[PDB]
Amino acid sequence: ATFKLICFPWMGGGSTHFAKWGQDTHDLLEVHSLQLVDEVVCALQPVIQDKPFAFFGHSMGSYIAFRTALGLKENNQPEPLHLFLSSATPVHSKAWHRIPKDDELSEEQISHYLMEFAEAKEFVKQCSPIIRADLNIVRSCTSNVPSKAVLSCDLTCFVGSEDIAKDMEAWKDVTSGNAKIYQLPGGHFYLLDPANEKLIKNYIIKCLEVSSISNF
């Protein structure tokens, strides 16, 4: 396989949906499965080798991929060849709102995150601890982020037309590279649509191939 895509899942999907392999031999896809960044950086070493790589993330995974990239540059490692972010409101924007502390959230407020279906009320109690921990990750990946472009890799934002994520156009500030945004038909999970998935996939492959052209 030429490239290696490192995918970061959303809250709920057990890293399954991003089991996108066989295309036919372009991407070796490896998925996350939930200073935590340090634990990821040295864990991507044995699989990155010296081959080129890219990051894709959805909602929660967008913040995680971003900080993982941001944390690779800090260790003087090479950044991802491309950073693909999906359905996430950037930390520095007019629409962003800070995630409250754990001890300031009620189970009811935790239950509203789980919806991102409302029928499930009793189940929320058993999913409560997973959710609160996931929010802890996101609360950290959105805390103390620089106000200066640290990254330099190219960046594409994907977002649904009926999405709850907003103002992704502002993600361009986190890097000095080229920033593109595509608005696709769907909600917060547009990317499940086999049409949108095909669009995203093909766009990822084209991106990495063009960025891999010799510097002549």
Give the residue numbers marked as catalytic.
59, 188
Amino acid at residue number 127: C
CA distance 147 to 200: 29
Among 7, 59, 174, 200, binds Cl ion (CB under 5 A): 59
9 versus 80: smaller Cβ distance to Cl ion: 9
In angstroms, give the least distance from the CB of 70 to Cl ion. Answer: 19
Measured from the CB atom, is 3 or 111 closer to Cl ion? 111
Interatomic CA distance for residues 197 and 203, integer angstroms: 10
Report which of 150, 159, 158, 156 is spatially closest to residue 68, judged by C-alpha positions: 150
| Widest Cα–Cα separation across the chain | 61
Which one, 59 or 156, has the nearer CB to Cl ion?
Answer: 59
Query: Which of 3, 8, 10, 189 forms a contact with Cl ion (CB under 5 A)?
Result: 10
Closest CA to 20 of 10, 11, 28: 28
5, 60, 65, 207: which one binds Cl ion (CB under 5 A): 60
Does 86 engage in binding with Cl ion (CB under 5 A)? Answer: no
Q: Minimum Å distance from CB 32 to Cl ion? A: 12
Does 56 contact Cl ion by CB under 5 A? no
Q: What stretches of the chain show up as alpha helix (H) in DSSP? A: 37-41, 45-48, 60-74, 107-115, 124-141, 194-210
If binding is defined by CB under 5 A, does position 131 make contact with Cl ion? no
Q: Which CB atom, from 10 or from 158, has the smaller least distance to Cl ion?
A: 10
**Applying CB under 5 A, does 11 fall inside the site for Cl ion?**
yes
Is 143 within 8 Å of 96 (Cβ atoms)?
A: no
Which residues, including other chains, have CB under 8 Å from residue 103's CB and lie 6 or more apart?
Answer: none
The answer to the question of residue 190 lying near Cl ion (CB under 5 A) is no
Stretch that binds Cl ion, among 3-11, 159-167, 182-190, 208-216 (CB under 5 A): 3-11
- The least CB distance from residue 206 to Cl ion, in Å, is 27
CB 107 within 8 A of CB 129: no
Size of the site for Cl ion (CB under 5 A): 4
Residues interacting with Cl ion, by CB under 5 A?
A: 10-11, 59-60
